[PDB]
Amino acid sequence: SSRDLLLKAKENGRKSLLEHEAKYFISSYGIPVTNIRLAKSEEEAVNFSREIGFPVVLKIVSPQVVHKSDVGGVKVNLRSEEEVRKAYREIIENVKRNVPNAEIEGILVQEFAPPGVELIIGLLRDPQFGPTVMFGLGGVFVELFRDVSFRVAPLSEQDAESMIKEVKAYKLLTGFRGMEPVDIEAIKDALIRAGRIGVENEEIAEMDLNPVIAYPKGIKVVDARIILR
């Protein structure tokens, strides 16, 4: 069961899931994620990279490193075996130097998501209303302008569709200069599932799917955070 991921984390006193565990967990609820593999050797990493296909992304996996970018732990758009081996050793040291007191679970091999319209899907727990789903456009639209919609879970299709149409940046999803319309049904579908995750899993305090990239067909969660309580 995917709950084994939550139970394992609680057993080891951890209050959040590692990146790969969070993607496994939401993937089991039917939310599309970047294809991933946990590599334990530079050799595993090349093999997994070929399986997944180029270009790939490599990320350090460690309970200590919560912000991978801010320690040289993220290598994006690797298109060759050599670029992979280069990124591998380089991440080992970028993190070995900035955090020498750090436990590596390994290095995540990950599919490189091509550019699209970025979204945020959140789950929070409101004191009155319990699990609540949050939606907004990615980047400055949520971070700077706070343009978000909320629905209390569980979400009906009607909730998911109206909360999408409600945000001020909604038009970024229906086609604009240099960008085709994106898959609104896939977004609705993920919002509903996000709500289901919140209703069902009491131990999940908070979840943040960010960035989520929307395409003319389908969406892909690129990063996922799950906090436990």
Partner: protein, 464 residues
Amino acid sequence: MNDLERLFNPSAIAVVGASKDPSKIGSQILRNLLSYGFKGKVYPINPTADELMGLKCYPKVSDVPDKVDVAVISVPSDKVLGVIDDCGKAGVKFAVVITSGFKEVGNEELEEELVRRAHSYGMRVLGPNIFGYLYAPARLNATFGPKDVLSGNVAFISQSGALGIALMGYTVVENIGISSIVSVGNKADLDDVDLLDFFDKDPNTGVIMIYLEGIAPGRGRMFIDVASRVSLRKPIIVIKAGRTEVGARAAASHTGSIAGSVAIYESAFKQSGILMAKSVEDAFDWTKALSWNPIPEGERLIVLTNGGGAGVQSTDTFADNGIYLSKPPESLIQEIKKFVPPFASFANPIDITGMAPDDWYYMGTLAALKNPDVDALTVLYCQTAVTTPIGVAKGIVDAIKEAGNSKPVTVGMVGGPEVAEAVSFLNKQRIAAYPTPERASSAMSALYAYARARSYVMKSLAVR
């Protein structure tokens, strides 16, 4: 424990705290109970008095030789627990605790102890810190507010004591017919969810209006589940206190709590099919319209006016509420062209011009309402010397009667003291009338807003 039938329709009520002193709260409540005409048994409870207001008095509820359903308790806070024990001994189902001095002043332990004790006896608590309640179908006025309200189908629930009791009086001035007033105050036990469950089932109640500061932690999901289901049949208007960030922090301290999320309350009200009013005036204006009209069956709203200006004010106000007018049906246009001058406008609003006499209002209103392709009507009148406000109002009344149907109608009349009387005349006929075109249009917009809110809920309950 969860059925409130005997709270609103008790056979026996005890009033604890009444005395020979007419200024005591308990005495005010007792006076209201008698003057409003309660037909069940009333038992004043007082340590020494042999009789109060002609009724045999007892020192304790447990001494009453009867099953007391409801005990209205008005004694000092340090005596309440004792009275609760006695009510418990007597088998009382509902404790209406008027008395203040509980959590709202920091005494949270006393308040929780109150509820704990009441629950140990299978008793529910309304309040504490409330002005009581009224239920018109049981001729029950157990408040120390005004002695009377107009009878009708509106249930009003208030978390605020002063504003609640004031609004209780204001319903008379605004001609709002009331089925119930419930002061819920501290909401330590019985809350809005429990009450909504009762008013859902009450055939006397058609509209519910709530002054709401906040909902208890962990209670919101149930609030949506219940309210959304009530909304399928009865409109709920909430006046939300603390609907701005600033106000939410303020009200947080007024009740001694942490600030609820504005955005999430708004989403919860949308999921509930609830209409949120930003002001008392909006709430009352909408309540009137919702209480006296069915929801429109479609979007064919007609605005009828004797002046372009009122019509444009109306068009703008509807537009602000996402309501857009479309061309009237040709049949209606032809009916009206029979008496109207050549340069009348039929774009919707239908402008029958400023020279329109009283009779054109009767004819226009009748034609509009009888037309099978008209779903709703807002009638606007600007006073001119060519007309009389009361003649226009009686024309509207006559047209509504003769049309026979029930299509939603609101009326906006602008003018001097004669319009003020005509508007009053219409509201006393339960025709929703207002002294400006924007308020009549905002009132009609509430009927549409409720139709759309109900549709939101229906869609959200659709089977997969």
